[PDB]
Symmetry: D4
Subunit: 119 residues, 8 copies
């Protein structure tokens, strides 16, 4: 039952992902590299991940499990220096949050858990 | 200026992605494999992609470009037969819609276009 | 019990109708034939049909029935070339989606089904 | 310029259509013929037409035109006695409100009016 | 049990009151007597009464009672000719809808009805 | 220019009216005299007046006028002891807030003020 | 059981706090000391406290307790004369409403009350 | 011009405060110490601070200033062990975020800055 570690790691990973999505958003918001259509897309994903991270917290208490929170790490930079480097970063970061959601799911498959099969 | 092909292909790709996200959602909605927490997640992504696909349509008319719509292809199946195979499919499909968004962006970088730099 | 065919055909017909309503909307959105009050009306009907099409999908799983999705056919054109030809098209297309809803209802009348009597 | 008559007639026709859609809705709401999924569909169309009727009123004052209101006629019955007779009635009534919208539009085509071309 | 007459009369009275509130609203909306802050107040009361009129319809079916709809009479004029004459009219009309709500309530007091005591 | 007194008196009168509407609402909310349909109606009017009272405050600063706030007087009782005595009270109190709105309007008529003509 | 006094005092304290937050908001709204970003922050806290004050009223009727309302005292001034003096006032006033919420909670701790432990 | 340090410190302080408000919320959400009315209050403050923290980020780019993000520190515990100790913590933490907002404001007073005077 090492899955509890994967819950709090999935919790802190989406929490981190919205934090990276937030600084990406307000980077394109600076007067200097104004790209309104990108600052809006990244702000929304920031809110989308922050909501999905809380949905998993609620589903944890529904399962009688414990929630341990770690730091939300600093985003790897404050300037992404481009809309195309940040898209590379979000593309790999979106894959990291969805592969880890799949990683934690194959753990609950090998041990049939009717409540951990969701998330 | 082959980018117009990549616009309508990006338009039809997100339109398709929400269509796959919809059948994934209502698959877990069938009384037989009831996984409410998955049918809700896939329904939301279906609405999220359908909205983002229309956002790109609006940004196209803001650019004086033409919008050509193709069929929204049938989802590759009506039963995903698992919550873990569908997660594999969405993980690769989410990567296909975000890599193609990056593909179309490096095309507009090589030809500076101040309006196509967004999307 | 040929009605299941009429369900998936009613599902794919409203799905198609919103797709036609979408291209109609963004046609009047092009800078060239800007008719803001028409692009707004057709965008709303597109969202109205897409919602009503999902309502019927939900009502199908409530009935233990199967949902089979076909392609959403390409709209018959990308340019309607007028606000009055498109109104003819939507008037006949709105009649086609409401007559087929009535067609499927007289099928459930001849075979009393207390759940198929709704839709 | 007989079109002003067609405006107030289109205004009072959608106003009437929502009134018929309302009594249809609360008919299926009576404990006796409870068909929740029909009372909800007709309530929404009642709100949809009442909104669209006010949208045309606003567009009239934008055109400097006069708004004359007539009675909202009594719905042709208080009991539709069936979900299939009411669907016939709404199908023909939906056609009457969309054909008259097309009727008024071919009037503004023969006399180019850049503001009456919308509605 | 003459109260059913007072229900449908209270139903048609609020329905009428929103109809008067609507024409009052769009009167101050005409370019000629533009008083934006009045057209907004009367539009809202029009929506407020139309909602409260439907709330009473729902409460009627909860009571197993019948709903009979009459015409929504034409508003007594299309031009109120002033913001101060219309305020007189709404002040007396608001009193007419709230006194009749009290009239119908003293009828249900004299005959204890635990469901008609609300409205 | 005694109208400023009538502004702050109209401000404090609607502020008071929502305060009376609030205690009326939560009176019918007590387990003892549970009349859910009345506690909901009075809660809404409480929110409706509190909003309309702030709308007049905003319109005052748009006019460069001063806003002086007095106490919101205690509601005349905590128990209305009936749904029919409170309806009498609200009927007269609704008339007091709408007559005073008319009182302040005939003051601005006698002295043409293009901004005080609204409210 | 002196806690009922602390309920109505907590009720009237948040009611007062929103009243102070309202005049603070519309003070910075006057053309003279226009600080839009402050008038918005204080308007929101005014709505936030007014909502939280009603939440406690509802929780009181859930507990079968009585609600006695006092006057909402006049805010200590109509002009705060600065954005920094008002911040001092709100900082101490926010502490007064949260310490009193804690004051009332240690009263319910000393007397175990499973419903008063919330608020 | 040491104020930029106080901006990013105010940004990271509200970001932290919502993070503490979140774990406080879902602590009372655990089946073990279920206090629904507290988990709801702390969840809302978590969303309220997360929004207010982004409002200050937007106001920073409006000022041409730089945004540097630090870690969101781990909340000082995962269990507050009581609803009364957490209220002490939030009372002092709410004072820390509002005193620092006042601290940064007296810095902009001593150096008249017409845009930093808001926040």
């Amino acid at each position: 039952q090492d899955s509890e570690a994967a819950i709090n790691r999935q919790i802190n990973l989406e929490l981190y992902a919205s934090y990276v999505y937030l600084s990406m958003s307000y980077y394109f918001d600076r007067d200097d590299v104004a790209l309104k259509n990108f600052a809006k897309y990244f702000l929304h994903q920031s809110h989308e991940e922050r909501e999905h991270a809380e949905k998993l917290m609620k589903l944890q208490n529904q399962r009688g499990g414990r929630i341990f929170l770690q730091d939300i790490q600093k985003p790897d930079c404050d300037d992404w220096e481009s809309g195309l480097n940040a898209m590379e970063c979000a593309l790999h970061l979106e894959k990291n949050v969805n592969q880890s959601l799949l990683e934690l799911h194959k753990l609950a498959t090998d041990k049939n858990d009717p409540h951990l099969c969701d998330f």
